[PDB]
């Protein structure tokens, strides 16, 4: 508080001049090796440097595709054990690798996730590098490939939920019409029937949904899915059909071995609105009695 | 003196926290742009940077032919007005051009000149960028080529003179057998009866020196130098090939309109030796007589 504030600035010209003379180390070997990543190294101390959009020197280059440096920087990166700066969100919560997702650069997502970089981190959406791969604006599961091959932090991703009501990325690619992914997910571990916080709905009951035919049987079929699961209100797919009124998908529904037996709520003692009940539409219901009455029962 | 330091120390943090904090901006730059330069001119203030031998950074590229870098480096330096760091000396007292003619870069040693670099500086020898050029283990015109071409600071060269006893380039020619400079010389300009601070000697003197008898004849033909021209110690070309014992030499020089009247030393009243005196070759002694009394003699 007194004159002694002195001590204070000459303490940062001492560990500080050592940085300005690193660089002119680091400067004199880019004379006799034209190597930018030497120069890159001397200036270590330096690639958390923000911008008017709080993005770091890497996270610019991955903006630009300057793939060539990107190589380096990262180079100095892990060789720097400051293995850290590689998660340094800009203003909009954005990590490196959530931007090679987004700019779809696979072959920089893969690159980072080599060294460090966890896909964990969401953004100012809360979604994680998975999250974001399963989305474009026309869709690319070649993303959600670098992400599933190597990596150890990457295993656990296929068990988040995003920040909408937490729809996992089982419910994702559903909801993205590709079981490309759906496939891709399962495939290396991931729970077919999940539940979501929402309404508790799974892979077929957003399939059912968007009446994605294509998947429902998908689904149902080769994942083995369970067709009569209840959603929070009570609801299996075979409900969601009948009410929007989607013949063919009830029709695959029942014979996928749909229990026409269920009740959401009142139209022990507690009974209430059946398949049956709830449909708009003439062709639903002849199924749903035809295929009631007769064939088993009572 | 007193705990009053404290302005110095923090004054210090002032004016050079800009530069760490110039070269994290310049560093991103380089991050949406790949240009080597931009990340390089971020460090702009440290291009003077020396080592162990006291090599500029420029000043080990053109060691190792970094041309790549060399190429940059000039840049930032030419857009900066710093055109001084290009002639910071080495512990040899080396400048940038002076290696880049050692190493007989003569594309460096072009590019180098156009932006200032004083040609005028002379290494721990004293020979100037020229004096250098007009030296090689083998020889090679093509360096003095670069600089006789364009260069304002240029043509004073050819009038200087090195340490050894001052031999104006026109003398270093002759010294390196080769008449192929000795016309590039002459022709942009050089004084051909230069007289050198030593023993006032010529360039013929030289050549009749080393008995260049090539050089000897191209110099009193189509250099129309002037044939009897004597040192301090008074002689003329005449007089060194007689001693020597050059036959062929003097009766070229003869022919050239080399008068036998000259005489060095004593061997008004004020008579000394004379051509046809110091002579241990039978030969020579023939013409210088023959020669004498027949055409032309009292």
């Known amino acids: 508080q007194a004159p002694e504030m002195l001590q204070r600035a000459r303490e940062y010209n001492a560990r500080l001049f050592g940085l ?63 293995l850290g700066v590689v998660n340094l969100t800009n203003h909009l919560h954005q ?30 959406h809360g979604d994680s590098a998975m999250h974001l791969a399963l989305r474009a604006g ?36 559903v909801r993205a019409r590709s079981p490309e992914c759906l496939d891709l997910l399962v495939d290396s571990g991931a729970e077919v029937e999940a539940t979501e916080r929402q309404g508790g709905r799974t892979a077929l009951h957003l399939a059912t949904e968007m009446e994605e035919l294509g998947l429902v049987t998908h689904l149902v079929t080769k994942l083995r899915a369970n067709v009569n699961a209840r959603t929070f209100a009570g609801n299996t797919p075979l409900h969601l059909a009948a009410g929007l009124g989607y013949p063919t998908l009830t029709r695959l529904l029942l014979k996928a071995g749909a229990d026409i037996h269920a009740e959401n709520e009142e139209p ?27 064939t088993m029962e009572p």
Chains 1, 2 share one sequence.
Do not use: W
Request: charged share 15%.
């Open 138 to 173: 026309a869709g690319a599961p070649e993303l959600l490939r670098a992400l599933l091959q190597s990596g150890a932090p990457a295993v656990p991703q296929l068990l988040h939920m995003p920040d909408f009501e937490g729809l996992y990325p089982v419910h994702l690619a």
């Open 268 to 294: 022990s003692s507690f009974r209430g609105h059946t398949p049956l009940d709830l449909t708009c539409s003439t062709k639903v219901k002849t199924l749903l009695l035809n295929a009631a009455q007769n």
């Open 95 to 124: 990590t490196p690798l959530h931007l090679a997702v987004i700019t779809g650069q696979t072959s920089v997502v893969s690159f980072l996730l080599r060294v460090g970089a966890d896909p964990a981190l969401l953004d100012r």
């Open 20 to 82: 300005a003379q690193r660089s002119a180390r680091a400067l004199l070997d880019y004379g006799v090796t034209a190597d930018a990543r030497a120069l890159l190294a001397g200036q270590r101390h330096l690639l958390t440097a923000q911008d008017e959009n709080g993005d770091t020197p890497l996270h610019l280059a991955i903006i630009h595709g300057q793939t060539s440096v990107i190589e380096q920087i990262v180079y100095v990166i892990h060789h720097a054990q400051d």
